[PDB]
Amino acid sequence: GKTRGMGAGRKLKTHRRNQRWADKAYKKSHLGNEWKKPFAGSSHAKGIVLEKIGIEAKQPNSAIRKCARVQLVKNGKKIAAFVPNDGCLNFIEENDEVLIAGFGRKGHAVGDIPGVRFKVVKVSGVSLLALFKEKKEKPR
Amino acid sequence: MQNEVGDMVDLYVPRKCSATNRIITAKDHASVQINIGHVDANGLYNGSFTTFALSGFVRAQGDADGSLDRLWQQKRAEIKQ
Amino acid sequence: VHVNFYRNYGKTFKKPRRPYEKERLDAELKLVGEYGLRCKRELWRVQYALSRIRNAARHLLTLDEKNPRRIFEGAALLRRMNRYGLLAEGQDKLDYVLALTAENFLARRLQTLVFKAGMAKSIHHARVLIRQRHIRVGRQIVNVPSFMVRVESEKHIDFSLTSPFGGGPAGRVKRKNQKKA
Amino acid sequence: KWVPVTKLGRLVKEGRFTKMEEIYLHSLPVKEHQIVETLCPGLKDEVMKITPVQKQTRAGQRTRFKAFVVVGDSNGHVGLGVKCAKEVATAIRGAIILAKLSIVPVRRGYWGNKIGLPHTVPCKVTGKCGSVTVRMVPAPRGSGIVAARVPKKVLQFAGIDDVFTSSRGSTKTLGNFVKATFDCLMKTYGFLTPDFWRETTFTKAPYQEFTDIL
Amino acid sequence: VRVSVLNDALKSMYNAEKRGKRQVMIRPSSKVIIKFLIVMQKHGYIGEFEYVDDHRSGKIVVELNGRLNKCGVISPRFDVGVKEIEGWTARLLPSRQFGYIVLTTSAGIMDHEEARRKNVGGKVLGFFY
Amino acid sequence: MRAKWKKKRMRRLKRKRRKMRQR
Amino acid sequence: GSLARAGKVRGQTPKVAKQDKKKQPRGRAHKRIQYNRRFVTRGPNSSE
RNA sequence: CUCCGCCGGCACCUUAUGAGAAAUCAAAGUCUUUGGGUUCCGGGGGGAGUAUGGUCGCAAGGCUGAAACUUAAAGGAAUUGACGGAAGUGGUGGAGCGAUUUGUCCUUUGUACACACCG
RNA sequence: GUCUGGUAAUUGGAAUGAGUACAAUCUAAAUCCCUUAACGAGGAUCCAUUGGAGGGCAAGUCUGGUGCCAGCAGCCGCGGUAAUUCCAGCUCCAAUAGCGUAAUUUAAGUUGUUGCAGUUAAAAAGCUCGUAGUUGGACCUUGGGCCGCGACCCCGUUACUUUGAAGAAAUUAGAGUGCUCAAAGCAAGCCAUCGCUCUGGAUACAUUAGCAUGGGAUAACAUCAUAGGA
Ligand SMILES: [K+]
Ligand SMILES: [K+]
Ligand SMILES: [Mg+2]
Ligand SMILES: [Mg+2]
Ligand SMILES: [Mg+2]
Ligand SMILES: [Mg+2]
Ligand SMILES: [Mg+2]
Ligand SMILES: [Mg+2]
Ligand SMILES: [Mg+2]
Ligand SMILES: [Mg+2]
Ligand SMILES: [Mg+2]
């Protein structure tokens, strides 16, 4: 059983403190390892397109996901960022500013794309959605 | 349950087990109701009777026979039967 | 420091926890169509107000009938519910406040009462009439259709004196047409 | 049209009964659904879910369909039927009959002052089926049904306006979720409360009441 | 060891009532158990009970009338002010209409309603309904 | 792989790492 | 992998212009239309 | 030796009025009607009882014990079928939370297979 | 047939503010608002969007294109020629002047004090002793009546509880009050008043620790036959 005594407040508090480290979410929050991530705790980061690459999907699916290799500016960390919206790889060029965001699963890989948790959202200051919908044009 | 106006608000008032005082539910199909007839002098059956209802729980335990025999001793004493 | 930072403000509604439930969508649309609402947020804010009133009434019901706070705040709540026409005279208890629905609050809008008074042909015609500044409550013209009308102000809902439907001069459409003629 | 095969069915056909609570008083088993239709006319009917169950065979899989059906008059009577059949239409038809056959009384009470008509569960009540445990807490008038979709439907057909609920276990197993809620509603005329402390008068059972007819 | 004699008394009574027994023997006896039993009897949830003196910790033989759904202790005996009685009754009682929480107060051992009537707080012994 | 043999394999790599880093 | 086929299908898809249709009422009137359709008058988009 | 009791012990049989996901358990019961006391200890699956630090040991090793990263299951009980280099079709009613089962008396048995061992 | 409903870039007159603008008002000066001449709607182009339409989850097993590619997909999945899921058109759905996307709360009784687990799913130390810690059997002034819910009669502590004083304001809860409503604000109201309503500008909450009052059931500590008592 568990301790129930009126004078056992310290026992209960210390036990809860020690057991909270078993929870994955608690330990992810309070370990400090999220500051060693490429984004270092920020929702978005900017980076330089180093080279356009195509990485194969998982086993059941057969596709080339056509991501981008991005070197961040805040820390110089190289990441792979997915480019959604069919045809948007042609808006991506080497040595071009891009705003990266998370792939929506908090550093966990998403879908059939292995090892990618980052998507390109903005290129050269123009959103990829605007370029897909032809609402704006990429500056020369 | 009575309303503050003064009306009964329950659909019905269920029977209680005569031995364990437990409420006899509508789907308690192991429950029964025994009518013990009343006899006057010479052994003739009057046409009146006492009623006992036993829940399915007390019958399932097996104490139904002893419970019913004790209840009948008590009422027989009281009504001179 | 900026003094304007001390002015209070707050939210008037919440969104549903389940966005795509058929039954709730049908009920909300039925109420919206019945009362000519512009969106679901107008019904959601009425539900928010009803929620706060209901919470207050429930909290005083969970206190003794001699608790001086329940005597005082329940009297104030009953006064407020009788003032805006939400409760009858026989309904003079905190229990009846818990039974109020968003229908009761929507029935006290200036749009609903303008429609039911015969001034407008439909609930939507009532909404436009109020938003066109044709309606006054007492001497004050009200262009806000979510205006909650008190029982003492119900008999003073009337057409504006500056409005063409309330003894005023003709509107620009009519005047332009006669000038053309 | 209908030939009653039970003694209870005969009396219901003739009209010796007017309400289903006379059957409830004596805990009689109801085995003909025409009895419930005769005595509880305001019954609605809703199919909660259809589930495919597969029995592995030598040649592929034998698929049958399980239908869950809830009936009720929204005035203190609710019933749940589960029928599995080779055809969906007959699975639903069989479940409606079973749901009517399991129409049980539901006790309704007041959260606070007993003003107006009962609107909530009289007391805290719990039902369990499989790993699913369903708790129902009496709620103040106007609270509505604070429950998941599956128990909300059964509470609406039971005639309960206000109730707080909590559930634990795999409520994703809808058969258990609905059965646990129905068991919770059934165990509501069974909690002894001081208002039921008055001794039972033991009226005559309809079997002995109409032995002249039967 | 025996830590709470009240818990053993109430649990034995609960088990006997569930079993349909009409008499339950309580050992050991104590003033707190007789005081809890008096509250129980006053509210009509039990019948006669008899203290049997054995020149030791006593014995209590209680008549059961089938009106008990549950009786139990709360351990620890948490401090309950008059204002926290509402929260405790919501936690432990089936409804706001029935059920009793038993408190030990400097004014005596009493049910929560009687504690409200004298505005006296204390510690929770248990509950019955 | 059987858990006993996995443990034996891991004890062998550890012997090796120990005899390398320490010596 | 090969990046040459990026934009293949969207470039292949023939361009179909949008029909110039009447605007639907906006706001309270739109809710009036929806209320009428689903309360005073197969799914909403059944291919009948 | 025989019979009847009492206390204590290793156990066994039946039964559900109980509990349980069930297997099953007379405790694994007296739990959403949740509180007798107390110790240790778990928080999806791997990485991993691995690295490192510390400590004990002659050593073998023991005790304490991560992270990065990876993954959508892993796992438990039970059912039907299939397989074994194992043995010799409704209805209604009943049982089961249920898949199912009884009825229908190839069967029993094991299974980590279910595209079903050509696994 | 009549009665009553919904539909049409049909057909008609009404209505009006977005905008423009005399002016006044505003204002330190300006400006915005409020007010208001004149003007200002028919496809009232004075043109509403953001996301979706396999399931979760509301809405299509419509049409064309692509054909395990391009792509979508939070998850399960879709795409190999009949794609309800990609690219589009049409239609429909949700919210709506907003909506989509990328730490924390809820959901989570998946941290569990209330309130989770540990035979087989993750989890009882191999076993026992043992300090601290936590937890510890029962027992001691009760009845009784009277007056009248109080009372009457026959120089050990502490926890706990009760009451009181404090615990800034703002924030929160909440009384009053028609800023046109509302979010607000702390104003205001009065038949019109050389003034008045002393106008209002409440109240509640505020752990723990501290101070004080009553209570002693429960419990803790200290004693507890040199009482060697007085
Ligand atoms: K023995
Ligand atoms: K059968
Ligand atoms: Mg527990
Ligand atoms: Mg783990
Ligand atoms: Mg069957
Ligand atoms: Mg749908
Ligand atoms: Mg499409
Ligand atoms: Mg768990
Ligand atoms: Mg194992
Ligand atoms: Mg294990
Ligand atoms: Mg003691």
PDB file of N, CA and C (backbone and C1' of nucleotides) in Angstrom, chain D residues 31 53-58 62 64 66 83 86 124 126 128-131 135 168 176 179 191, chain H residues 20-22 32-34 80-82 89-94 97-101 114-116:
ATOM      1  N   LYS D  31     -41.012 -11.605 -21.800  1.00  0.00           N
ATOM      2  CA  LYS D  31     -40.482 -12.439 -22.867  1.00  0.00           C
ATOM      3  C   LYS D  31     -41.148 -12.191 -24.212  1.00  0.00           C
ATOM      4  N   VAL D  53     -18.169  -8.403 -36.696  1.00  0.00           N
ATOM      5  CA  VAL D  53     -17.403  -9.423 -35.990  1.00  0.00           C
ATOM      6  C   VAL D  53     -17.118 -10.560 -36.960  1.00  0.00           C
ATOM      7  N   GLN D  54     -15.891 -11.071 -36.923  1.00  0.00           N
ATOM      8  CA  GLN D  54     -15.437 -12.080 -37.868  1.00  0.00           C
ATOM      9  C   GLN D  54     -15.046 -13.353 -37.135  1.00  0.00           C
ATOM     10  N   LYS D  55     -15.567 -14.477 -37.608  1.00  0.00           N
ATOM     11  CA  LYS D  55     -15.191 -15.799 -37.131  1.00  0.00           C
ATOM     12  C   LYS D  55     -14.309 -16.448 -38.186  1.00  0.00           C
ATOM     13  N   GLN D  56     -13.049 -16.697 -37.840  1.00  0.00           N
ATOM     14  CA  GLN D  56     -12.119 -17.292 -38.790  1.00  0.00           C
ATOM     15  C   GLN D  56     -12.563 -18.704 -39.150  1.00  0.00           C
ATOM     16  N   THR D  57     -12.611 -18.990 -40.446  1.00  0.00           N
ATOM     17  CA  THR D  57     -13.037 -20.281 -40.961  1.00  0.00           C
ATOM     18  C   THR D  57     -11.951 -20.832 -41.875  1.00  0.00           C
ATOM     19  N   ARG D  58     -12.175 -22.053 -42.367  1.00  0.00           N
ATOM     20  CA  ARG D  58     -11.227 -22.669 -43.289  1.00  0.00           C
ATOM     21  C   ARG D  58     -11.099 -21.855 -44.569  1.00  0.00           C
ATOM     22  N   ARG D  62     -15.988 -15.535 -41.727  1.00  0.00           N
ATOM     23  CA  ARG D  62     -17.442 -15.448 -41.666  1.00  0.00           C
ATOM     24  C   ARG D  62     -17.803 -14.180 -40.903  1.00  0.00           C
ATOM     25  N   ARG D  64     -20.335 -11.501 -39.379  1.00  0.00           N
ATOM     26  CA  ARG D  64     -21.659 -11.154 -38.895  1.00  0.00           C
ATOM     27  C   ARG D  64     -21.634  -9.715 -38.400  1.00  0.00           C
ATOM     28  N   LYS D  66     -23.087  -6.885 -35.584  1.00  0.00           N
ATOM     29  CA  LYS D  66     -23.642  -6.688 -34.254  1.00  0.00           C
ATOM     30  C   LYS D  66     -24.268  -5.303 -34.172  1.00  0.00           C
ATOM     31  N   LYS D  83     -27.935  -7.452 -30.782  1.00  0.00           N
ATOM     32  CA  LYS D  83     -28.200  -8.630 -31.594  1.00  0.00           C
ATOM     33  C   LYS D  83     -27.166  -8.714 -32.704  1.00  0.00           C
ATOM     34  N   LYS D  86     -26.356 -12.233 -39.540  1.00  0.00           N
ATOM     35  CA  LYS D  86     -25.653 -12.249 -40.817  1.00  0.00           C
ATOM     36  C   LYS D  86     -26.001 -11.036 -41.668  1.00  0.00           C
ATOM     37  N   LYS D 124     -25.495   9.071  -6.117  1.00  0.00           N
ATOM     38  CA  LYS D 124     -24.377   8.552  -6.889  1.00  0.00           C
ATOM     39  C   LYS D 124     -24.593   7.074  -7.182  1.00  0.00           C
ATOM     40  N   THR D 126     -23.140   3.707  -9.921  1.00  0.00           N
ATOM     41  CA  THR D 126     -22.036   3.255 -10.751  1.00  0.00           C
ATOM     42  C   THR D 126     -22.418   1.960 -11.452  1.00  0.00           C
ATOM     43  N   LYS D 128     -20.609  -1.172 -14.098  1.00  0.00           N
ATOM     44  CA  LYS D 128     -19.370  -1.735 -14.611  1.00  0.00           C
ATOM     45  C   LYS D 128     -19.671  -2.854 -15.597  1.00  0.00           C
ATOM     46  N   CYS D 129     -18.959  -2.842 -16.722  1.00  0.00           N
ATOM     47  CA  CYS D 129     -19.040  -3.910 -17.713  1.00  0.00           C
ATOM     48  C   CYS D 129     -17.689  -4.014 -18.396  1.00  0.00           C
ATOM     49  N   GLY D 130     -17.058  -5.182 -18.304  1.00  0.00           N
ATOM     50  CA  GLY D 130     -15.676  -5.282 -18.741  1.00  0.00           C
ATOM     51  C   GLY D 130     -14.797  -4.397 -17.885  1.00  0.00           C
ATOM     52  N   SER D 131     -13.886  -3.675 -18.530  1.00  0.00           N
ATOM     53  CA  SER D 131     -13.046  -2.721 -17.823  1.00  0.00           C
ATOM     54  C   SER D 131     -13.695  -1.349 -17.696  1.00  0.00           C
ATOM     55  N   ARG D 135     -19.663   6.203 -13.672  1.00  0.00           N
ATOM     56  CA  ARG D 135     -20.206   6.852 -12.489  1.00  0.00           C
ATOM     57  C   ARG D 135     -21.156   7.962 -12.909  1.00  0.00           C
ATOM     58  N   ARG D 168     -14.018   5.248 -16.444  1.00  0.00           N
ATOM     59  CA  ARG D 168     -12.662   4.731 -16.460  1.00  0.00           C
ATOM     60  C   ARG D 168     -12.654   3.404 -17.200  1.00  0.00           C
ATOM     61  N   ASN D 176     -19.271  -2.384 -24.031  1.00  0.00           N
ATOM     62  CA  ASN D 176     -19.082  -2.312 -22.552  1.00  0.00           C
ATOM     63  C   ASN D 176     -19.520  -0.936 -22.072  1.00  0.00           C
ATOM     64  N   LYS D 179     -23.296  -0.891 -22.096  1.00  0.00           N
ATOM     65  CA  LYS D 179     -23.810  -1.858 -21.111  1.00  0.00           C
ATOM     66  C   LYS D 179     -23.558  -1.325 -19.695  1.00  0.00           C
ATOM     67  N   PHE D 191     -30.876   1.358  -4.787  1.00  0.00           N
ATOM     68  CA  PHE D 191     -30.179   1.890  -3.589  1.00  0.00           C
ATOM     69  C   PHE D 191     -31.212   2.233  -2.519  1.00  0.00           C
TER      70      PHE D 191
ATOM     71  P     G H  20     -13.882  -5.673 -10.064  1.00  0.00           P
ATOM     72  O5'   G H  20     -12.856  -6.388 -11.045  1.00  0.00           O
ATOM     73  C5'   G H  20     -11.469  -6.382 -10.756  1.00  0.00           C
ATOM     74  C4'   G H  20     -10.742  -7.482 -11.483  1.00  0.00           C
ATOM     75  C3'   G H  20     -10.971  -7.564 -12.981  1.00  0.00           C
ATOM     76  O3'   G H  20     -10.229  -6.594 -13.702  1.00  0.00           O
ATOM     77  C1'   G H  20     -11.070  -9.733 -12.036  1.00  0.00           C
ATOM     78  P     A H  21     -10.927  -5.728 -14.861  1.00  0.00           P
ATOM     79  O5'   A H  21     -11.366  -6.822 -15.932  1.00  0.00           O
ATOM     80  C5'   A H  21     -11.854  -6.456 -17.212  1.00  0.00           C
ATOM     81  C4'   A H  21     -11.293  -7.362 -18.275  1.00  0.00           C
ATOM     82  C3'   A H  21     -11.204  -8.834 -17.900  1.00  0.00           C
ATOM     83  O3'   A H  21     -12.428  -9.525 -18.099  1.00  0.00           O
ATOM     84  C1'   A H  21      -9.155  -8.128 -18.851  1.00  0.00           C
ATOM     85  P     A H  22     -13.246 -10.119 -16.850  1.00  0.00           P
ATOM     86  O5'   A H  22     -12.837 -11.659 -16.795  1.00  0.00           O
ATOM     87  C5'   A H  22     -13.239 -12.570 -17.807  1.00  0.00           C
ATOM     88  C4'   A H  22     -12.048 -13.244 -18.434  1.00  0.00           C
ATOM     89  C3'   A H  22     -11.464 -14.424 -17.668  1.00  0.00           C
ATOM     90  O3'   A H  22     -12.133 -15.636 -17.979  1.00  0.00           O
ATOM     91  C1'   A H  22      -9.729 -12.936 -18.304  1.00  0.00           C
ATOM     92  P     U H  32     -17.061   0.537  -5.310  1.00  0.00           P
ATOM     93  O5'   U H  32     -17.159   2.120  -5.402  1.00  0.00           O
ATOM     94  C5'   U H  32     -16.115   2.887  -5.992  1.00  0.00           C
ATOM     95  C4'   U H  32     -16.599   4.264  -6.362  1.00  0.00           C
ATOM     96  C3'   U H  32     -17.742   4.294  -7.379  1.00  0.00           C
ATOM     97  O3'   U H  32     -18.617   5.381  -7.082  1.00  0.00           O
ATOM     98  C1'   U H  32     -15.918   5.527  -8.207  1.00  0.00           C
ATOM     99  P     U H  33     -19.793   5.206  -6.004  1.00  0.00           P
ATOM    100  O5'   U H  33     -19.033   5.238  -4.607  1.00  0.00           O
ATOM    101  C5'   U H  33     -19.563   5.952  -3.500  1.00  0.00           C
ATOM    102  C4'   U H  33     -19.561   5.114  -2.247  1.00  0.00           C
ATOM    103  C3'   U H  33     -18.582   3.941  -2.242  1.00  0.00           C
ATOM    104  O3'   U H  33     -18.090   3.752  -0.917  1.00  0.00           O
ATOM    105  C1'   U H  33     -20.775   3.137  -1.923  1.00  0.00           C
ATOM    106  P     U H  34     -16.763   4.510  -0.430  1.00  0.00           P
ATOM    107  O5'   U H  34     -15.706   4.209  -1.582  1.00  0.00           O
ATOM    108  C5'   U H  34     -15.196   2.896  -1.789  1.00  0.00           C
ATOM    109  C4'   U H  34     -13.830   2.928  -2.421  1.00  0.00           C
ATOM    110  C3'   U H  34     -12.748   3.611  -1.586  1.00  0.00           C
ATOM    111  O3'   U H  34     -11.492   2.954  -1.768  1.00  0.00           O
ATOM    112  C1'   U H  34     -12.977   4.729  -3.662  1.00  0.00           C
ATOM    113  P     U H  80     -13.095 -21.632 -29.422  1.00  0.00           P
ATOM    114  O5'   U H  80     -12.971 -21.341 -30.983  1.00  0.00           O
ATOM    115  C5'   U H  80     -14.121 -21.077 -31.774  1.00  0.00           C
ATOM    116  C4'   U H  80     -13.752 -20.474 -33.106  1.00  0.00           C
ATOM    117  C3'   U H  80     -12.882 -21.326 -34.017  1.00  0.00           C
ATOM    118  O3'   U H  80     -13.601 -22.324 -34.718  1.00  0.00           O
ATOM    119  C1'   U H  80     -12.032 -19.127 -33.953  1.00  0.00           C
ATOM    120  P     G H  81     -12.927 -23.758 -34.985  1.00  0.00           P
ATOM    121  O5'   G H  81     -11.875 -23.490 -36.150  1.00  0.00           O
ATOM    122  C5'   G H  81     -12.300 -23.082 -37.440  1.00  0.00           C
ATOM    123  C4'   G H  81     -11.190 -22.416 -38.215  1.00  0.00           C
ATOM    124  C3'   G H  81     -10.001 -23.286 -38.588  1.00  0.00           C
ATOM    125  O3'   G H  81     -10.242 -24.103 -39.720  1.00  0.00           O
ATOM    126  C1'   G H  81      -9.241 -21.203 -37.767  1.00  0.00           C
ATOM    127  P     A H  82      -9.492 -25.515 -39.865  1.00  0.00           P
ATOM    128  O5'   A H  82      -7.992 -25.131 -40.242  1.00  0.00           O
ATOM    129  C5'   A H  82      -7.670 -24.505 -41.477  1.00  0.00           C
ATOM    130  C4'   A H  82      -6.234 -24.040 -41.492  1.00  0.00           C
ATOM    131  C3'   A H  82      -5.194 -25.108 -41.175  1.00  0.00           C
ATOM    132  O3'   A H  82      -4.813 -25.857 -42.316  1.00  0.00           O
ATOM    133  C1'   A H  82      -4.809 -23.224 -39.811  1.00  0.00           C
ATOM    134  C1'   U H  89     -26.831 -23.549 -40.533  1.00  0.00           C
ATOM    135  C3'   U H  89     -25.305 -21.970 -39.645  1.00  0.00           C
ATOM    136  C4'   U H  89     -24.770 -22.522 -40.953  1.00  0.00           C
ATOM    137  O3'   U H  89     -24.959 -20.611 -39.439  1.00  0.00           O
ATOM    138  C5'   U H  89     -23.309 -22.891 -40.969  1.00  0.00           C
ATOM    139  O5'   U H  89     -22.912 -23.525 -39.763  1.00  0.00           O
ATOM    140  P     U H  89     -21.377 -23.836 -39.476  1.00  0.00           P
ATOM    141  P     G H  90     -25.434 -19.844 -38.110  1.00  0.00           P
ATOM    142  O5'   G H  90     -26.906 -19.354 -38.464  1.00  0.00           O
ATOM    143  C5'   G H  90     -27.790 -18.901 -37.455  1.00  0.00           C
ATOM    144  C4'   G H  90     -29.214 -18.874 -37.947  1.00  0.00           C
ATOM    145  C3'   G H  90     -30.266 -18.569 -36.895  1.00  0.00           C
ATOM    146  O3'   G H  90     -30.394 -17.181 -36.650  1.00  0.00           O
ATOM    147  C1'   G H  90     -30.952 -20.427 -38.195  1.00  0.00           C
ATOM    148  P     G H  91     -30.439 -16.624 -35.145  1.00  0.00           P
ATOM    149  O5'   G H  91     -31.913 -16.971 -34.660  1.00  0.00           O
ATOM    150  C5'   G H  91     -33.044 -16.593 -35.432  1.00  0.00           C
ATOM    151  C4'   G H  91     -34.276 -17.324 -34.973  1.00  0.00           C
ATOM    152  C3'   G H  91     -34.467 -17.390 -33.468  1.00  0.00           C
ATOM    153  O3'   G H  91     -35.066 -16.219 -32.949  1.00  0.00           O
ATOM    154  C1'   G H  91     -34.777 -19.539 -34.399  1.00  0.00           C
ATOM    155  P     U H  92     -34.322 -15.383 -31.802  1.00  0.00           P
ATOM    156  O5'   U H  92     -34.812 -16.082 -30.461  1.00  0.00           O
ATOM    157  C5'   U H  92     -36.197 -16.210 -30.181  1.00  0.00           C
ATOM    158  C4'   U H  92     -36.479 -17.406 -29.311  1.00  0.00           C
ATOM    159  C3'   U H  92     -35.622 -17.545 -28.068  1.00  0.00           C
ATOM    160  O3'   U H  92     -35.999 -16.688 -27.006  1.00  0.00           O
ATOM    161  C1'   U H  92     -35.735 -19.623 -29.154  1.00  0.00           C
ATOM    162  P     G H  93     -34.864 -16.058 -26.060  1.00  0.00           P
ATOM    163  O5'   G H  93     -34.434 -17.270 -25.121  1.00  0.00           O
ATOM    164  C5'   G H  93     -35.393 -17.935 -24.315  1.00  0.00           C
ATOM    165  C4'   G H  93     -34.901 -19.279 -23.843  1.00  0.00           C
ATOM    166  C3'   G H  93     -33.583 -19.295 -23.091  1.00  0.00           C
ATOM    167  O3'   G H  93     -33.694 -18.861 -21.748  1.00  0.00           O
ATOM    168  C1'   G H  93     -33.588 -21.033 -24.674  1.00  0.00           C
ATOM    169  P     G H  94     -32.509 -18.001 -21.088  1.00  0.00           P
ATOM    170  O5'   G H  94     -31.319 -19.046 -20.921  1.00  0.00           O
ATOM    171  C5'   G H  94     -31.441 -20.156 -20.047  1.00  0.00           C
ATOM    172  C4'   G H  94     -30.196 -21.007 -20.056  1.00  0.00           C
ATOM    173  C3'   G H  94     -28.881 -20.282 -19.833  1.00  0.00           C
ATOM    174  O3'   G H  94     -28.644 -19.964 -18.474  1.00  0.00           O
ATOM    175  C1'   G H  94     -28.650 -21.839 -21.598  1.00  0.00           C
ATOM    176  P     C H  97     -19.537 -12.443 -18.096  1.00  0.00           P
ATOM    177  O5'   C H  97     -19.912 -11.530 -19.347  1.00  0.00           O
ATOM    178  C5'   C H  97     -20.747 -10.390 -19.199  1.00  0.00           C
ATOM    179  C4'   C H  97     -20.310  -9.263 -20.100  1.00  0.00           C
ATOM    180  C3'   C H  97     -20.108  -9.628 -21.564  1.00  0.00           C
ATOM    181  O3'   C H  97     -21.320  -9.567 -22.297  1.00  0.00           O
ATOM    182  C1'   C H  97     -18.257  -8.364 -20.779  1.00  0.00           C
ATOM    183  P     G H  98     -21.775 -10.778 -23.244  1.00  0.00           P
ATOM    184  O5'   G H  98     -20.785 -10.693 -24.487  1.00  0.00           O
ATOM    185  C5'   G H  98     -20.614  -9.484 -25.210  1.00  0.00           C
ATOM    186  C4'   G H  98     -19.307  -9.477 -25.960  1.00  0.00           C
ATOM    187  C3'   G H  98     -19.063 -10.679 -26.860  1.00  0.00           C
ATOM    188  O3'   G H  98     -19.653 -10.497 -28.134  1.00  0.00           O
ATOM    189  C1'   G H  98     -17.140 -10.258 -25.526  1.00  0.00           C
ATOM    190  P     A H  99     -20.131 -11.746 -29.021  1.00  0.00           P
ATOM    191  O5'   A H  99     -18.851 -12.104 -29.896  1.00  0.00           O
ATOM    192  C5'   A H  99     -18.253 -11.142 -30.748  1.00  0.00           C
ATOM    193  C4'   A H  99     -16.837 -11.528 -31.086  1.00  0.00           C
ATOM    194  C3'   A H  99     -16.655 -12.943 -31.613  1.00  0.00           C
ATOM    195  O3'   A H  99     -16.887 -13.035 -33.008  1.00  0.00           O
ATOM    196  C1'   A H  99     -15.081 -12.523 -29.893  1.00  0.00           C
ATOM    197  C1'   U H 100     -17.570 -16.946 -29.417  1.00  0.00           C
ATOM    198  C3'   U H 100     -17.662 -18.497 -31.180  1.00  0.00           C
ATOM    199  C4'   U H 100     -17.120 -17.177 -31.712  1.00  0.00           C
ATOM    200  O3'   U H 100     -17.093 -19.617 -31.833  1.00  0.00           O
ATOM    201  C5'   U H 100     -17.813 -16.639 -32.934  1.00  0.00           C
ATOM    202  O5'   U H 100     -17.158 -15.488 -33.437  1.00  0.00           O
ATOM    203  P     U H 100     -17.933 -14.107 -33.575  1.00  0.00           P
ATOM    204  P     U H 101     -18.027 -20.806 -32.370  1.00  0.00           P
ATOM    205  O5'   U H 101     -18.527 -21.529 -31.046  1.00  0.00           O
ATOM    206  C5'   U H 101     -17.602 -22.045 -30.102  1.00  0.00           C
ATOM    207  C4'   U H 101     -18.279 -22.363 -28.797  1.00  0.00           C
ATOM    208  C3'   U H 101     -19.421 -23.363 -28.872  1.00  0.00           C
ATOM    209  O3'   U H 101     -18.960 -24.703 -28.867  1.00  0.00           O
ATOM    210  C1'   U H 101     -20.055 -21.498 -27.542  1.00  0.00           C
ATOM    211  P     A H 114       0.872 -14.201 -39.134  1.00  0.00           P
ATOM    212  O5'   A H 114      -0.587 -14.662 -39.565  1.00  0.00           O
ATOM    213  C5'   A H 114      -0.825 -15.259 -40.835  1.00  0.00           C
ATOM    214  C4'   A H 114      -2.296 -15.497 -41.074  1.00  0.00           C
ATOM    215  C3'   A H 114      -3.181 -14.253 -41.020  1.00  0.00           C
ATOM    216  O3'   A H 114      -4.263 -14.405 -41.936  1.00  0.00           O
ATOM    217  C1'   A H 114      -3.883 -15.790 -39.370  1.00  0.00           C
ATOM    218  P     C H 115      -4.292 -13.569 -43.307  1.00  0.00           P
ATOM    219  O5'   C H 115      -3.417 -14.446 -44.305  1.00  0.00           O
ATOM    220  C5'   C H 115      -3.939 -14.865 -45.562  1.00  0.00           C
ATOM    221  C4'   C H 115      -2.844 -15.109 -46.573  1.00  0.00           C
ATOM    222  C3'   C H 115      -1.706 -16.010 -46.100  1.00  0.00           C
ATOM    223  O3'   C H 115      -1.213 -16.768 -47.204  1.00  0.00           O
ATOM    224  C1'   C H 115      -0.844 -13.885 -46.673  1.00  0.00           C
ATOM    225  P     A H 116      -0.806 -18.311 -47.019  1.00  0.00           P
ATOM    226  O5'   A H 116      -1.048 -18.605 -45.472  1.00  0.00           O
ATOM    227  C5'   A H 116       0.031 -18.587 -44.548  1.00  0.00           C
ATOM    228  C4'   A H 116      -0.414 -19.009 -43.172  1.00  0.00           C
ATOM    229  C3'   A H 116      -0.870 -20.449 -43.031  1.00  0.00           C
ATOM    230  O3'   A H 116       0.203 -21.367 -42.941  1.00  0.00           O
ATOM    231  C1'   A H 116      -2.422 -19.037 -41.964  1.00  0.00           C
TER     232        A H 116
END
